[PDB]
Amino acid sequence: DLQLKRKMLESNKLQQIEKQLYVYFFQNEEQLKSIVGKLEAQTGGGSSA
Amino acid sequence: KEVQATVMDWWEQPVQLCLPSEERGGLTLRQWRERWTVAVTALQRATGSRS
Amino acid sequence: NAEYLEAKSNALFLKLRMEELQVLTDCYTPEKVLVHRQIRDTLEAGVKKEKQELSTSRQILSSYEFLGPEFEGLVQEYTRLKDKIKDNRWMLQELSKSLP
Amino acid sequence: EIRSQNMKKLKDKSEEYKYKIHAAKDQLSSAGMEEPLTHRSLVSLSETLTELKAQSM
């Protein structure tokens, strides 16, 4: 069971960052906005005001 | 059995759901995670990259 | 045979313990430990504030409970009547908006 | 005779495990990890706070 779960964390970088999100939430708000913003900008969405 | 419990705690990290009302940048952690999950899912849809 | 079985049992137990300690080192990095500390402090401050509020409210309720069952009956009646008046007023307001 | 040979291999492996367990206990202590700071201990503490808000309401 341990070998399977370690392998799963080494292959999926996005899941590793997900697991670090709560750390960013309590330490660095700017980083949290940045990390989540970079991932949203990359996704082109034309916001109308 | 105890070692199995420890392995489980390491994988789920339950301490992230312990403060729900705490807002940072006008949003809760859950909201942030949700934003993350939507963004990750949008990226995965664009990047044909069928997960 | 007895010595061999003893050596096998000890080796299996040590493997299991090693693997447990490796998982714990991977889970509690210095950065995370700091966060876990912040979360504790907020939770502990909440537990302390709520324990104090619970103690004050329980002290006031104890003064009314001392006026007997008869008073409680009266309070229940009063409360029932206020609830019916509130319902009737609410019904009258809704009939006036409908005069087309 | 086969078991006696296998017993020697097992004793060597046991000595190897004892060495890795010390090295890991030393790394956890340097990270400032205490028991009340664990997931299990902190969850337990959050569950106690919810229970107390319910009692206060």
Residue numbers in the entry:
A (entry chain B): 549 to 597
B (entry chain D): 616 to 666
C (entry chain C): 254 to 353
D (entry chain A): 173 to 229
Copied sentences from the primary study:
In mitosis, the augmin complex binds to spindle microtubules to recruit the γ-tubulin ring complex (γ-TuRC), the principal microtubule nucleator, for the formation of branched microtubules. The elongated structure of the augmin complex is characterised by extensive coiled-coil segments and comprises two structural elements with distinct but complementary functions in γ-TuRC and microtubule binding, linked by a flexible hinge. The augmin complex is recruited to microtubules via a composite microtubule binding site comprising a positively charged unordered extension and two calponin homology domains. By acting as an elongated structural scaffold, augmin positions the γ-TuRC on the pre-existing microtubule in a partially flexible manner, allowing the γ-TuRC to nucleate a branched microtubule in an approximate orientation with respect to the mother microtubule.
We subjected the negatively stained augmin particles to 3D classification to obtain a 3D reconstruction of the augmin holocomplex in a defined conformational state, in which the TIII tetramer could be unambiguously identified. The remaining density clearly reflected the clamp-like overall shape of the predicted TII tetramer models and the hammerhead-like region formed by the N-termini of TII HAUS proteins was recapitulated in the density, allowing us to confidently determine the orientation of TII in the 3D reconstruction. The approximate placement of the predicted TII tetramer into the negative stain 3D class indicated an interaction between the TIII H3/H5-arm and the TII C-clamp. Guided by these insights into the overall organisation of the augmin holocomplex, we used AlphaFold-Multimer to predict the structure of the TIII H3/H5-arm in combination with the TII tetramer. In all predicted models, the TII C-clamp interacts with the periphery of the TIII H3/H5-arm in a manner that is fully compatible with the negative stain 3D reconstruction of the augmin holocomplex, as judged by seamless fit of the composite TIII tetramer-TII C-clamp model into the EM density, thus providing an accurate model for the interface between the TII and TIII tetramers. We thus individually docked the TII N-clamp as a rigid body into the remaining density segments guided by the orientation of the N-clamp HH. Merging the TII N-clamp with the model for the TII C-clamp in complex with TIII, we generated a model for the complete augmin holocomplex. The N-clamp is linked to the TII C-clamp by a hinge region, which allows for an opening and closing motion of the TII clamp, as suggested by the ensemble of predicted models.
